Design a protein around this motif. Sequence first.
Motif, PDB file in Angstrom:
ATOM      1  N   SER A   9       0.823  -1.205   0.000  1.00  0.00           N
ATOM      2  CA  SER A   9       0.000   0.000   0.000  1.00  0.00           C
ATOM      3  C   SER A   9       0.859   1.258   0.000  1.00  0.00           C
ATOM      4  CB  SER A   9      -0.941  -0.009   1.205  1.00  0.00           C
ATOM      5  OG  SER A   9      -0.217   0.112   2.417  1.00  0.00           O
ATOM      6  N   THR A  10       1.926   1.271   0.796  1.00  0.00           N
ATOM      7  CA  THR A  10       2.816   2.424   0.844  1.00  0.00           C
ATOM      8  C   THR A  10       3.965   2.334  -0.150  1.00  0.00           C
ATOM      9  OG1 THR A  10       4.117   3.832   2.323  1.00  0.00           O
ATOM     10  CG2 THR A  10       4.296   1.455   2.613  1.00  0.00           C
ATOM     11  N   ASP A  35       3.921  -8.126  -0.925  1.00  0.00           N
ATOM     12  CA  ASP A  35       4.314  -7.477   0.317  1.00  0.00           C
ATOM     13  C   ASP A  35       5.670  -7.994   0.781  1.00  0.00           C
ATOM     14  OD1 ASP A  35       2.120  -5.673   0.928  1.00  0.00           O
ATOM     15  OD2 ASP A  35       0.895  -7.475   1.213  1.00  0.00           O
TER      16      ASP A  35
END
Lengths: 149, 100, 50, 228, 229, 70, 49, 50, 101, 277
Positions: E151-152, E169
């Motif tokens: 997400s980041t 991830d």
Amino acid sequence: DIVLNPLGVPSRMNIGQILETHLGMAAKGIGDKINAMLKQQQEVAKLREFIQRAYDLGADVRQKVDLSTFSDEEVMRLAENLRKGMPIATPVFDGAKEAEIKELLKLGDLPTSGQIRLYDGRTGEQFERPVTVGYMYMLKLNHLVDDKM
Amino acid sequence: SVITVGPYLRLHQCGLPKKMALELFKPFIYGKLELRGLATTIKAAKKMVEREEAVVWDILDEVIREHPVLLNRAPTLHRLGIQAFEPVLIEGKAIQLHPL
Amino acid sequence: MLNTCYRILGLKPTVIFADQIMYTGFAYAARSGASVGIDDMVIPEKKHEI
Amino acid sequence: TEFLKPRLVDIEQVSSTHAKVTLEPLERGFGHTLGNALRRILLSSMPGCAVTEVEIDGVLHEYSTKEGVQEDILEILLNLKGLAVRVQGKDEVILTLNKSGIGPVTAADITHDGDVEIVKPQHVICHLTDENASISMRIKVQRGRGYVPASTRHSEEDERPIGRLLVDACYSPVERIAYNVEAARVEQRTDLDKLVIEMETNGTIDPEEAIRRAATILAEQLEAFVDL
Amino acid sequence: TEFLKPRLVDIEQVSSTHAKVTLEPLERGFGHTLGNALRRILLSSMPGCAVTEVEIDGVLHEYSTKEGVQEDILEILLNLKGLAVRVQGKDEVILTLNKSGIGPVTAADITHDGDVEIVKPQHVICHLTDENASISMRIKVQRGRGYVPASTRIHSEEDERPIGRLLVDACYSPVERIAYNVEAARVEQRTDLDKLVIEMETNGTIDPEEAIRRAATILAEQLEAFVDL
Amino acid sequence: ARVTVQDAVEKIGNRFDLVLVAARRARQMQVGGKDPLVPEENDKTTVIALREIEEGLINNQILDVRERQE
Amino acid sequence: VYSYTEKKRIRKDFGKRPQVLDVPYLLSIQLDSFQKFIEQDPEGQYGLE
Amino acid sequence: QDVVLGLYYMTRDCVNAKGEGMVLTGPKEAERLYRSGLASLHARVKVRIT
Amino acid sequence: ETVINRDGQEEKQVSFNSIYMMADSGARGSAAQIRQLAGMRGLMAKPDGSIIETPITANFREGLNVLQYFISTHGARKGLADTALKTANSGYLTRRLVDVA
Amino acid sequence: KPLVGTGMERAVAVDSGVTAVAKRGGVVQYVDASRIVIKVNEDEMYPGEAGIDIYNLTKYTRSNQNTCINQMPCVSLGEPVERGDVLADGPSTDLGELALGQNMRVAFMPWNGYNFEDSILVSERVVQEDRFTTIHIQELACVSRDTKLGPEEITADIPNVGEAALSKLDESGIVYIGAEVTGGDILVGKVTPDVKDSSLRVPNGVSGTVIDVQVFTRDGVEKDKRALEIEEMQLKQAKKDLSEELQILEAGLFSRIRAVLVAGGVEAEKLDKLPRD
């Protein structure tokens, strides 16, 4: 990984979850033991004995499995499938009593009380009271935070 | 939004998610932004805050400091249903509330 | 306790005192450790006979 | 590597010796680590000087009171407990305190020497009656580390001849330390641990620098295998 | 007075994945102070190597159904996430794999290079069921510390993202389980001298000695700013 | 900054004309405003008035009398 | 007993009472009912006939 | 709910624990005895307070 | 429960059991909940008001027969329905108090 | 799997029709991530029809609660199966057993009030390994109606837009498959004719990757470039599915005819050199 609040159970009376936690901690102990000697590259003969005691334990039960008649390959497959923890089935009104729980804790290397010594993560001290730890099967509900906000 | 327990706050403090804080206080942000002269027009301020740059967070934390917000559950049964608090900007998407 | 304070010292001492109560109670409940288990609920032995 | 160096220290303290310090928001979880290490070192891990043995001229049993004093034996031991002296050179020193008359018994009449360096010598020790109150005793000050309880000084071995009363005293100058950690923000992140320490001592050393000493101590413990 | 500065001895290995290290005798009360600090540093910040981006030739998005393989692509991404790799030369290295024919695709099939090292060649990713089921993917590996979600990682937002990209991830955590025990060491005549032992579980990418050395170095660097006014 | 009005209650206890005069103060401190009588630490006028209650020379009855002064 | 899919992961249980009747098909309430409404039942008293 | 039990555990008294029967200068000492793990959280000490 | 010796003979004092700590401190629960957990749950009444003549002889920690659980079901359903339907009539009453006053 | 269960998990999993169950016993011949081919047992398959079983597992599809359904083949090559045996596992199940959540390791103790009354603590380890992360599928529908001021066209030219906005778009006005869309972006471009851009935009906040696109229209109407290309893709997919089905059936047919031609006189050279025809 999960830290709950004990104060819920004395009033809400849902004391069965404590027994579920005790069984869950007990169930993993058999799984690690298998994981202990499966990772050690041990002969199938050693497994056949141990899992034999893990299935014939308890009082008179309707379960009667002959482990020594499947194969060597099928027993290896079972060991590879039970390394994460041996499942336990509990009928609704015909479940297991405390004696079966204690006996299954005998098979592992875990305390009978179900409460073990813990250590504070920050201070590195020891909690003055033993704390119950175990494996509980929990669900994530459909009330997502993003939809509600 | 949903609530949670912030057991590190004072009696006159409640948490707020960053997204909700900026959404609520964007009209105050434009007035704060245009006063400092960083933006030129309302469209300029809106497109500046749209990218969520560095100055936006600090000016928002400046305007949050003294601007109480009113919290109230849906069934406001009695006189304490509506209370006020000083917001404290935090990360998440839940209203962090004092326990007591 | 709080009531007594509210009738001796005013408002600000009472609110700061309540905040200190909350902080100390939380800290020394976490540091204490209080779990519930099967061995903690003891069944009276006489009950069956009764 | 590529770490957040703490800066923006604080120095304000509303007291003579009671200091509070705040730091730049450290990385997640580092505030608790440093706070715990500093607290555990500061509680029981410095060299220090404190009374260890007191012998009273007249008192034999630890509960045998004497006339001429409105306080008790336990009260006088508690009074002399916060003596707060620092001795240099020899780690063991003996001193005598004699006072006859009426009124309070301060610390100025301790018959000070070149190795006492007593701070705020107005600490009340005893109260006296008209003329019978001519008290005298001897105090032994020793250099030790941290806190030693009375029991560990093993105490009930009957090695003390008559009235060589042991005193439960602490060498650590720090009297109370407590630290809090709370959230702080950076230009885009808003979860960084920021630390505040509540430090106060008995006035022997400045609280602003006292913690510094402790830091150096732990630094030594890492000088053996610190890569640089 | 003195403080008996402790060094490290008995850095032996037992199972090539987890190691027990021992320290020279410490002062009284110093076993718990160093032990907790070292454990927290170990579980907090370590240099680690992990996969972030994967690009399979025959796929549009992660929720596709690649022909030939008998499992979905989400489990492919999960298995790649669980893979442990050790790069030494540089920090950012791109890996590629090519396999065909019936049989499981173990990690040993990766195109190993001189600047990278595979610690678990027997790790499996996908099973091929067809004699003509050619598969091909490009793996992006880089260094980091802590946990970073995808997400980041899209914060770059440069639109340099073709359809074939897949973001997995990252978990730059070479250490999994850490623990320590304090034991009363035997010395010349002192009694406050007690040894400390640390048992650490690793995926096999970082040696315990350099791990604890870097942990102590980081703690000392942090305390350097603390020892000031 | 300031959060409670116990000082206002203990001597000038009233919650209604006090906030009215505080609003009258703050309105013309915001537009057509002048320098305050106490130091400012990144506050707006929505809290500076209450602190002026603590100093004593500004109080609820004072503003009503001070209205004649203006 | 102990079918091949059962041998994959045998689930231990503590059952004292031996079950005599198996669990029925959990949808017989629906299926059978609709089975009456649409079937080509001769001389049907309950049906579209 | 939670803080009340923490305060209850703060103020109890067992019949025998580590560090009991001695005396302390004040409440400041009791904090250092407990934090350094030399005395139990609840004991039978005699402390002087103002 | 607690019996701890102090220099020889054993002495009794207040128990440190967690359940009793919750009950006595007043944090949560009361005598009724602790009685139900270990002692008799108590004889329940039929919803019409009649009290059954066979009380439950087992606590939650011990096993419960299917009839005992079934008997204890409608005892809680009545309360749950009352609570569910009480949110309307009671609150409406406040309205009839606000308009007059 | 649930560490502690009841024994009805298998019954609830298999009685419901979500999971794929082997209709006829036999042995497995070819496994795939999307389809299963089962070589039916010889003594079980009735004469006349000598084919083999095909199970076309479903994939990610929109559900009434926007959750995802995807069957996973839980079998391998060359292992026997029985009648009524589980062959695939749908959502929230594995190995023919119900599984609704995850088995966490939990401890009952107050902790700094973060679990004050009913709240819970979660270790960052579980969010590292994604043990609870879910997948949701959302449907966005855009209709093209006809008002009095001419029908609204779905063309790719729109005033007051930037090239960055249309970069994700194609030249027909509909986004590709797999393009990671963000909040407020345009999926299909439509303007109402002065043209009012009545296009479909992603609702604010939600952002993901487009899985599928579907187009429906009446007979006798224009078909854009993307419409014709997706129609051709569907035609090719249907042809491929039919070809695979018929070639599998023909492999079974060749096997059966070879089995019945091994007796009664078979040409040795024709068996191993000449093709089957």
